[PDB]
Amino acid sequence: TTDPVRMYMREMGTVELLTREGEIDIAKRIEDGINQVQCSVAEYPEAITYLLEQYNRVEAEEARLSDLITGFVDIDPELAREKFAELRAQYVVTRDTIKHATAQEEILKLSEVFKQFRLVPKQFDYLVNSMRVMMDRVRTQERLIMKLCVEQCKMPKKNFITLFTGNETSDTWFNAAIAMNKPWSEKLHDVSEEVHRALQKLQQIEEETGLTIEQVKDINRRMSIGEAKARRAKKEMVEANLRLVISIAKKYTNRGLQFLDLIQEGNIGLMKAVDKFEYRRGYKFSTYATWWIRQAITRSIADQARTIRIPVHMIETINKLNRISRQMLQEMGREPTPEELAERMLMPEDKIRKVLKIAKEPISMETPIGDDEDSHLGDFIEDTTLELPLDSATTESLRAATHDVLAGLTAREAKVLRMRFGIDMNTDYTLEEVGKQFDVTRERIRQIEAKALRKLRHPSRSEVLRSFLDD
Amino acid sequence: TPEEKLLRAIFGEKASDVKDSSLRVPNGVSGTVIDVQVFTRDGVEKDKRA
DNA sequence: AAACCTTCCCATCAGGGGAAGGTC
DNA sequence: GACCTTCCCCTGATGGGAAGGTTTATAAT
């Protein structure tokens, strides 16, 4: 075959299905990966300082209680007051005791109370991005301090990593390589400003993230592994239950939308139903995924069907009206009355006619007209924009008639008329507008205009213009 | 156009806000009216001739 | 398809103020 | 002549509403 629908219809026959084993087997893998990435945040003082600001603002009317947490692994509103002071049992035992020997085995018990508060993915993603931005900030300094010595001073990469691995904090390593007398040593005094001050944005991070420059790398080093596990699992999940999406999508044939469009818009909802699914509840995955798949198909139809896009609500309401008219064909015998569905529906009466009036579909201009000839609809379509030439001639004639007539009046009245009206001039002028540059204002012009319109109202000077009026 | 506005000011001939539809007999044929029907939509009250 | 919810744009309502009117 | 009550135009509120967005749990290939 050729059609790209065949490439897909037989692209899923590769990954075998997954039922009763697959689901619960790889869901555990998903959670085991997110657990690796979750404890990566357990040691991040910036997360504590950021949690305080968004926590106290909840009691000050900015952020909802159930908007920042999905629950605690430990819907009860009373389970809150009991876990806001009992978790600080390790808060101040390791921070002010750096004054850092016994502050190495007392960091796990402080981070343990940080994995019992399930935050909403909205802020959770901000936390993940926070660690990412911290890694990029720390790394910018390394890719600075490195190329300032290797690519410029021509020093071996290994003499750089050997002197850098372990410190990454102070300048004890840079100024110590000056005594090596190597060919690159004599070129280290010039870059002593792009590497010394470089630690101002690198070493300072330590006093912000409360951790050595190297630990900031360890955290993300394992976090990436966890997120990779999660990705590799979810892709297999959707590949396995892919056929279900087609099973659901084949229920929408003539929906103003191609088949593949539907199956794809349904695969999107499949992914969404996957990411928000817990294998713990026991309920099979086929029941849950179907909701998001079928909805991401239905609403998608409501959004890509009509050439004139319509808000979702209207689609729902119109389809309901159609349903009521359908289930009443057998009752009334032929079809319901116009003002009948007004009561059967929750909506009022007079909205039916408008809802049905806008429900028309555009006809392809290529729809062949009667006689079945090659003549199409787009051939009988007129053009009511261009004015016929029979009127353009009248315009070019009135222009000259008005010109001659106005040139028959006085000079003052002439300019006053060509001013109050946009005659042979850009944008006509108001009363005081004319009076502004005609030396007498506000009623002079109001008299001049009436006088001139009266000297033209009189015949023997209006016949020419008067003929242009025919009613 | 301003040239027309000058006319509307001179002879005081205000312009209607309405266009014209006017089912008029096709040019080339002349006949006699033998039947006139009127179909009004439901709800909208009928006119006199209706 | 139904159910609960946030943002925006509407075309309108108490409330303030700058004076305004009328008399014991 | 002041004092009280009255008569109209801006600020900004804020009720109403159309338009969008997120979930929905038996399983459903």
TrEMBL record, chain A:
Q: Where is this region: Sigma-70 factor domain-2?
A: 237-307
Q: Give the location in the cell.
A: Cytoplasm
One Gene Ontology BP term is: DNA-templated transcription initiation
What ranges are recorded for DNA binding?
431-450
Q: Where is this region: Sigma-70 factor domain-4?
A: 405-458
Indicate which residues form the motif Interaction with polymerase core subunit RpoC.
261-264
Keyword DNA-binding assigned to the entry: answer is yes
Identification of the protein by name: RNA polymerase sigma factor RpoD
Q: Which organism is it from?
A: Escherichia coli
Highest lineage ranks of the organism?
Answer: Bacteria, Pseudomonadati, Pseudomonadota, Gammaproteobacteria, Enterobacterales
Which residues of the entire protein appear here: the answer is 94 to 613 of 613
